């Protein structure tokens, strides 16, 4: 067990995203005091900030992170990686700080087809934004409420691979599932 400064907090201030330069400083981490930001710039790399592009293999380092005290913001993510694998073991977001003061989970404009946050059992505060993920399915099938701390919590889960094409291309809850929800196709995704 170990709690690490996130992006923004501590020396990781002044730094827009998780990236090559800092990523390694998350090795064997448990809780994250702060926010997680994965921006376009993490994969493009930046000349201005003296920063090499990220080997999207190094996202596998996030695998041990159970708690995020602030918020999660994934705007970019490996075009061929189809899932949010790295965050499989992520169990809880506090939302103690929030994107625009509102959003504790932000999954925008990604190539994901499943979300795959299989261990996520609690968003303590803040709302969920799931936008523009052209091929994402399965998000609807879950009961977000079961993940929530107040009435005041919302889901702006708009503008993805319309639920129709899902059932059409057969992208719905695998049969084994106790109809409460899906994070993806296979049995290891029943909410």
């Amino acid at each position: 067990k170990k709690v690490c400064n996130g992006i923004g907090i501590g020396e990781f201030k002044d730094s827009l995203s998780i990236n090559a330069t800092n990523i390694k400083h998350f090795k064997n981490c448990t809780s994250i005091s702060g926010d997680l930001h994965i921006l376009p710039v993490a994969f493009r790399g930046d000349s201005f900030t003296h920063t090499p592009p990220l080997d999207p293999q190094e996202l596998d380092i996030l695998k041990t992170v159970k708690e995020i005290t602030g918020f999660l913001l994934i705007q970019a993510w490996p075009e061929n990686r189809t899932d949010l694998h790295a965050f499989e073991n992520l169990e809880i977001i506090r939302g103690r700080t929030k994107q625009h003061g509102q959003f504790s989970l932000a999954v925008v404009s990604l190539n994901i087809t499943s979300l795959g946050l299989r261990s996520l059992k609690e968003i303590s505060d803040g709302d969920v934004i799931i936008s523009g993920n052209k091929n994402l399915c399965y998000a609807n099938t879950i009961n977000w409420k079961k993940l929530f701390g107040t009435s005041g919590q919302k889901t702006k889960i708009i503008s993805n691979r319309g639920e129709n094409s899902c059932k059409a291309t057969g992208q719905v809850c695998h049969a084994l599932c106790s109809p409460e929800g899906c994070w993806g196709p296979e049995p290891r995704d029943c909410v």
Partner: antibody, heavy 121, light 107 residues
Framework: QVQLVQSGAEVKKPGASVKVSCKASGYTFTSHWMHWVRQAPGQGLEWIGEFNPSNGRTNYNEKFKSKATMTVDTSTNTAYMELSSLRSEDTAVYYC??????????????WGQGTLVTVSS | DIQMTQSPSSLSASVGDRVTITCSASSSVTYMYWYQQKPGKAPKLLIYDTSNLASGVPSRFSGSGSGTDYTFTISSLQPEDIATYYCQQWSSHIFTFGQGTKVEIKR
């Protein structure tokens, strides 16, 4: 469709308890947070707290943490609200109300007929 | 932790008249609701979020204001509008009600 049928009124001597029931008909129960609002007679509304009948999480208003306790029985679509150390000041209409935000983003809002509780000797 | 000052206590006005009920706030407030309680019936949500007219509610009802200042308005008071109206705020996990405003019709 959506209905909240709350238990009948009752009278209690100070010190006693009371478990006020609320049978939620007409919607998918485990889906909406259940609230309890108190109304002292001839008087305004005071919020006691909310219950997420799906996961069991709870949010009380300062004053009521000690007095009230919120519980649910999903098996029979019914939410309860039990009052401790009953005082002459607990005499009021107890309303339950399913208040929430729709997946649609819109607000969700339905109320019981309220259950009168008289504390007297 | 947030403390509401609703005003006025009572209000008499004629049919067709404009009824405006302010409801002020101590610190700042995320979400603002407006409820209507007709005698002997339970509360009824008319407006949520500040201005979003709940479903079914007629046009004459509205609610505005930003910051710590919220107004509720019945542009054209109808007889069936007799009730006491309450605002509530939701901020940082707890709800808080205003004191009420008895609206009464002059005839």
């Amino acid at each position: 469709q959506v209905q909240l049928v709350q238990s009948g009124a009752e009278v209690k001597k100070p010190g006693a308890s009371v478990k006020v029931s609320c049978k939620a008909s007409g919607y998918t129960f485990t889906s909406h947070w259940m609230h309890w609002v108190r109304q002292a007679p001839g008087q305004g509304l005071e919020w006691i707290g909310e219950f997420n009948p799906s996961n069991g999480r709870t949010n009380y208003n300062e004053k009521f943490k000690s007095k009230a306790t919120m519980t649910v029985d999903t098996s029979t679509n019914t939410a309860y609200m039990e009052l401790s150390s009953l005082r002459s000041e607990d005499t009021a209409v107890y309303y339950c109300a399913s208040r929430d935000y729709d997946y649609a983003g819109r607000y969700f809002d339905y109320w019981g007929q309220g259950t009168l509780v008289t504390v007297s000797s | 932790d947030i403390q509401m000052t609703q005003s006025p206590s009572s209000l008499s006005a004629s049919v067709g008249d404009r009824v405006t009920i302010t409801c002020s706030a101590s610190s700042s407030v995320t979400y603002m609701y407006w409820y209507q309680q007709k005698p002997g019936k339970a509360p009824k949500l008319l407006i949520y979020d500040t201005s979003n007219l709940a479903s079914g509610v007629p046009s004459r009802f509205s609610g505005s204001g930003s910051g710590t200042d919220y107004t509720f308005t019945i542009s054209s008071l109808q007889p069936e509008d007799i009730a006491t109206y309450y605002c509530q705020q939701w901020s940082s996990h707890i709800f808080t009600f205003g004191q009420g405003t008895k609206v009464e019709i002059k005839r």
